[PDB]
Amino acid sequence: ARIAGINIPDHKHAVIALTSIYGVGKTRSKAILAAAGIAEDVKISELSEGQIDTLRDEVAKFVVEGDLRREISMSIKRLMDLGCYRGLRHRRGLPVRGQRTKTNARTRKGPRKPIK
């Protein structure tokens, strides 16, 4: 049960199991399933090998897993290189999308750091 270079849980439903792949959420998974002709509710266990192959092929159509990750990294790196506002924010480690920083930026900032 290996799709796009990663192992996938057999007991789970197909839609959700595909979501284990970095690059597909629910909608993408659904689309993949539609393309295949495979029912959504069926498990990864009790599939034919041909079916699995078809699924893999379908997955291959989208930029997924490592490929996607690298691309994501590149964009960030590009921004950093630019030294634009977003890039600057990224380098700082603070909210890019114009969120408040006075309070509540703990996702970017991590845990609270006491004053020495």
């Binding site: 290996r2 090998e49 192959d53 893999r56 490929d67 690298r70 691309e71």
Partner: protein
């Protein structure tokens, strides 16, 4: 090599999505079913598309048209 200390080592058939049939000696025991192989793996095909640097100017041209 020594008689008893070693794990069982016997020839198995390694099937693939390619159609490629690969008879290889292994410790697996059962018949093996692969996802990818050396001939299949998108090294030669993928890595040109997989980088995808591109350009901004062309993108700009495409969507606005002036």
């Amino acid at each position: 090599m020594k008689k008893d200390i070693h794990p069982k080592y016997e020839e198995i058939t390694a099937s693939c999505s390619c159609g490629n049939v690969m008879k290889i000696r292994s410790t697996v025991g059962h018949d093996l079913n692969l996802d990818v192989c050396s001939k299949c793996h998108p090294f030669f095909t993928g890595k040109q598309r997989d980088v995808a640097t591109g350009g901004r100017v062309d993108r700009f041209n495409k969507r606005f048209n002036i």
